[PDB]
Structure formats: structure tokens, C-alpha cells
Design an enzyme around this catalytic site. Structure first.
Site, mmCIF file in Angstrom:
data_model
loop_
_atom_site.group_PDB
_atom_site.id
_atom_site.type_symbol
_atom_site.label_atom_id
_atom_site.label_comp_id
_atom_site.label_asym_id
_atom_site.label_seq_id
_atom_site.Cartn_x
_atom_site.Cartn_y
_atom_site.Cartn_z
ATOM 1 N N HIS A 62 -4.748 6.123 -1.809
ATOM 2 C CA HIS A 62 -5.233 4.766 -1.988
ATOM 3 C C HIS A 62 -6.125 4.473 -0.499
ATOM 4 O O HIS A 62 -7.091 3.633 -0.771
ATOM 5 C CB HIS A 62 -4.237 3.629 -2.137
ATOM 6 C CG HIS A 62 -3.328 3.917 -3.204
ATOM 7 N ND1 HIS A 62 -3.543 4.126 -4.283
ATOM 8 C CD2 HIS A 62 -2.007 4.477 -3.152
ATOM 9 C CE1 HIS A 62 -2.557 4.584 -5.242
ATOM 10 N NE2 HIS A 62 -1.687 4.888 -4.518
ATOM 11 N N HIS A 92 -4.558 0.480 8.366
ATOM 12 C CA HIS A 92 -5.652 1.129 7.477
ATOM 13 C C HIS A 92 -6.635 0.098 7.260
ATOM 14 O O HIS A 92 -7.006 -1.018 7.693
ATOM 15 C CB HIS A 92 -4.929 1.274 6.133
ATOM 16 C CG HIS A 92 -4.406 -0.168 5.742
ATOM 17 N ND1 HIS A 92 -3.134 -0.672 5.693
ATOM 18 C CD2 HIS A 92 -4.930 -0.848 4.625
ATOM 19 C CE1 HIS A 92 -3.029 -1.856 5.209
ATOM 20 N NE2 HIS A 92 -4.130 -1.973 4.242
ATOM 21 N N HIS A 94 -10.247 -0.665 4.051
ATOM 22 C CA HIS A 94 -10.317 -0.985 2.615
ATOM 23 C C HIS A 94 -12.001 -1.123 2.856
ATOM 24 O O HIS A 94 -12.376 -1.727 3.896
ATOM 25 C CB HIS A 94 -9.991 -2.216 2.108
ATOM 26 C CG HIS A 94 -8.572 -2.505 1.890
ATOM 27 N ND1 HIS A 94 -7.686 -2.038 1.038
ATOM 28 C CD2 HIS A 94 -7.809 -3.148 2.951
ATOM 29 C CE1 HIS A 94 -6.616 -2.263 1.214
ATOM 30 N NE2 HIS A 94 -6.524 -2.902 2.371
ATOM 31 N N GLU A 104 -11.828 -6.938 1.258
ATOM 32 C CA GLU A 104 -11.040 -7.753 0.531
ATOM 33 C C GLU A 104 -11.091 -9.104 0.478
ATOM 34 O O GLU A 104 -11.725 -10.172 -0.356
ATOM 35 C CB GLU A 104 -9.406 -7.304 0.647
ATOM 36 C CG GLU A 104 -9.280 -5.801 0.536
ATOM 37 C CD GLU A 104 -8.111 -5.331 0.246
ATOM 38 O OE1 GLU A 104 -7.013 -5.799 0.707
ATOM 39 O OE2 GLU A 104 -8.099 -4.806 -0.995
ATOM 40 N N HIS A 117 -6.913 -3.582 8.420
ATOM 41 C CA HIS A 117 -5.700 -4.476 8.406
ATOM 42 C C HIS A 117 -4.567 -3.709 9.294
ATOM 43 O O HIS A 117 -4.271 -2.678 8.866
ATOM 44 C CB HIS A 117 -5.104 -4.200 6.925
ATOM 45 C CG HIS A 117 -5.984 -5.098 5.917
ATOM 46 N ND1 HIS A 117 -5.846 -5.072 4.574
ATOM 47 C CD2 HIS A 117 -6.751 -6.002 6.165
ATOM 48 C CE1 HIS A 117 -6.535 -5.981 4.148
ATOM 49 N NE2 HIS A 117 -7.262 -6.498 4.726
ATOM 50 N N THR A 196 -2.099 -6.609 -0.712
ATOM 51 C CA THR A 196 -3.276 -6.530 -1.474
ATOM 52 C C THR A 196 -3.115 -5.241 -2.528
ATOM 53 O O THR A 196 -4.406 -5.255 -3.229
ATOM 54 C CB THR A 196 -4.551 -6.442 -0.806
ATOM 55 O OG1 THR A 196 -4.592 -5.536 0.013
ATOM 56 C CG2 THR A 196 -4.730 -7.832 0.238
ATOM 57 N N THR A 197 -2.144 -4.640 -2.568
ATOM 58 C CA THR A 197 -2.048 -3.432 -3.343
ATOM 59 C C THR A 197 -0.469 -3.673 -3.885
ATOM 60 O O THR A 197 0.181 -4.255 -3.717
ATOM 61 C CB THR A 197 -2.182 -2.088 -2.998
ATOM 62 O OG1 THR A 197 -0.919 -1.947 -2.204
ATOM 63 C CG2 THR A 197 -3.214 -1.975 -1.697
#
Ligand SMILES: C[C@]12CC[C@@H]3c4ccc(OS(N)(=O)=O)cc4CC[C@H]3[C@@H]1CC(=O)N(Cc1cccnc1)C2=O
Ligand SMILES: [Cl-]
Ligand SMILES: [Zn+2]
Length: 258
Positions: A62, A92, A94, A104, A117, A196-197
Site C-alpha cells: 500500500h 510512510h 502517500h 490526503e 506521515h 486513513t487506510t
């Protein structure tokens, strides 16, 4: 048929396995800078990453996680809207398929090229797992990335991505200093949110920095060479692994600055 970011398993499908996706404090959210209000009750934010000890970097299918040794109080986040000490466990990003999208959280609907993040868990709950069962179990420090000059402190991460191209691959990643990924200012917006996941747990106090860091086009391009798929499977570039803004609902975004 596991969750992902595709048309058939993306964000609009998550609610079926994770009903909380339509919850009351979901993340990310759009940050309306004009509606955000300065909060005097906020204490000075404290980011102490001096003793941070990274251990490994992993492609989890992901995104990629740079994990840290959190068996002791080293890299900690405290102050600001936080009560107590939160320990850094991993960070990590995004990012998008193009420079115009990837973050995000959005600022006045503006999407940045990516978002960093730094995940921390509240030490009063003993461990990461117990923390995600609490309303204030986690604190995530979000930092926007825009494309411009390169970020020297990020190159170490960029250069190891070739070794963890596919899902499931990991590599030793010791002595990485996350301090090299922070902007000058610690001005921030904060609000109660969620992961958020999936599982989208609502245990997060979000602290999103106002000042974005600049990364080069070459650096983000390497992010986009990663794969969502595992080794030996059809290649699906790891891009646009971001969830769109969710309803603010009964929440107010507070600013740390006047
Ligand atoms: C690994 C994990 C699922 C993914 C979670 C997850 C998902 C997205 C994520 O990205 S973002 N944008 O920062 O929200 C961060 C994390 C950090 C926590 C992590 C959980 C950490 C954890 O104890 N457990 C076990 C658990 C779950 C529920 C109750 N107790 C323990 C998980 O399953
Ligand atoms: Cl696709
Ligand atoms: Zn994230």
C-alpha cells in the site's frame, strides 16, 4: 479481494468491510484555513527525534514504511494538543501519479504532490495494539510535500526503494534520521481523526504542519516506480495511494498560530 486503491477495491469500497469508513471522525479532511481557529490552549509542540533508531523499511503493498525501534522512549512527540508522550513507531508517505495530486489532507482544497506521515502511539497504553483501541491512542504528524528543490534528508530513503520494489519486500534501514524530513516551521493545524487506510480506526489526533517540505521531481518519480503487486505478478505502479477528503462532520480544526 483485499482492499486497495483501485476502481474495484478503492476508498469508495472500504465501507463494506469497514463500516467506520462513514464514521463521525474520519480522515483525511480538507483544511479550510479561514475556518480554522487559533487555539490558545495548545501547548508548545515538541518533536524530539534525536535518539530515533530506524530498523527496517518495508513495502506493505500500500506504501512503504520506515520502522523504528519503539521498545524504549526515544523519538517522541509531545505538547501541542497532546496529553502525555507519544512514541514514534514508523513513517510512510502517500503520493500521486502526477505532481498535482497525492496528499490526503488538502489545504483550501489544494492537493500537494505527497504527504509524509510520522506515526506515534500514546505510551500510557503500553503498546501499539492497545493504543489503537483508545480514542487518543495515536498521534500522526503530517507533512506536505511539494515538487521543487530536492530534500537532502530524503535521498537515503529514495535510494533504498529499488531493493523493496514489490509487496512483502523489506530491507535493513538503520541509522536513518527523521529530523532531516522536517520543515523549518512547526506551525500546524490539529483535529481528531482516524487512520486513513483500513481498518480506519478513529484513534488519531492529527497534527498537520502548515509548511510543506520541497522534494525534487526525481525523488518523487522514484516513489512512483514502486509496485503495489508482489514479485512475479503483473506490474501495477504504486501511485495514488491516497484517500480523498472525508466529511468534517462535528469537528473543528484548530491552528497553533495566530
Ligand atoms: C497493523 C494494524 C493495522 C494497520 C494500522 C495502520 C493503518 C494505516 C496507517 O496509515 S495512516 N495514514 O497513518 O493512517 C497507519 C496504521 C498504524 C496502526 C496499524 C495497526 C497497528 C495494530 O496495533 N494492529 C493490531 C490491532 C488492531 C485492533 C485492535 N488492536 C490491535 C493492526 O492490525
Ligand atoms: Cl489500476
Ligand atoms: Zn498515512
Amino acid at each position: 479481494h483485499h482492499w486497495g486503491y483501485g476502481k474495484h477495491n478503492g476508498p469508495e469500497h472500504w465501507h463494506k468491510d469497514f463500516p467506520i469508513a462513514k464514521g463521525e471522525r474520519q480522515s483525511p479532511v480538507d483544511i479550510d484555513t479561514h475556518t480554522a481557529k487559533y487555539d490558545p490552549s495548545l501547548k508548545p509542540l515538541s518533536v524530539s527525534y534525536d535518539q530515533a533508531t530506524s530498523l527496517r523499511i518495508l513495502n506493505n503493498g500500500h506504501a512503504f514504511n520506515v520502522e523504528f525501534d519503539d521498545s524504549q522512549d526515544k523519538a517522541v512527540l509531545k505538547g501541542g494538543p497532546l496529553d502525555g508522550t507519544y512514541r514514534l513507531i514508523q513513517f510512510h508517505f502517500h503520493w500521486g501519479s502526477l505532481d498535482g495530486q497525492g496528499s490526503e489532507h488538502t489545504v483550501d482544497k489544494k492537493k500537494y504532490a505527497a504527504e509524509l506521515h510520522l506515526v506515534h502511539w500514546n505510551t500510557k497504553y503500553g503498546d501499539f495494539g492497545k493504543a489503537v483501541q483508545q480514542p487518543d491512542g495515536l498521534a500522526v504528524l503530517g507533512i506536505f510535500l511539494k515538487v521543487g528543490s530536492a530534500k537532502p534528508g530524503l535521498q537515503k530513503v529514495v535510494d533504498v526503494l529499488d531493493s523493496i520494489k514489490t509487496k512483502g519486500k523489506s530491507a535493513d534501514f538503520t541509522n536513518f534520521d527523521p529530523r532531516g524530513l522536517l520543515p523549518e516551521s512547526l506551525d500546524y493545524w490539529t483535529y481528531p481523526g482516524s487512520l486513513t487506510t483500513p481498518p480506519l480506526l478513529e484513534c488519531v489526533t492529527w497534527i498537520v504542519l502548515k509548511e510543506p517540505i520541497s522534494v525534487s521531481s526525481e525523488q518523487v518519480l522514484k516513489f512512483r516506480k514502486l509496485n503495489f503487486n508482489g514479485e512475479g505478478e503483473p506490474e501495477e505502479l504504486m501511485v495514488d495511494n491516497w484517500r480523498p477528503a472525508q466529511p468534517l462532520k462535528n469537528r473543528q480544526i484548530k491552528a497553533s498560530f495566530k
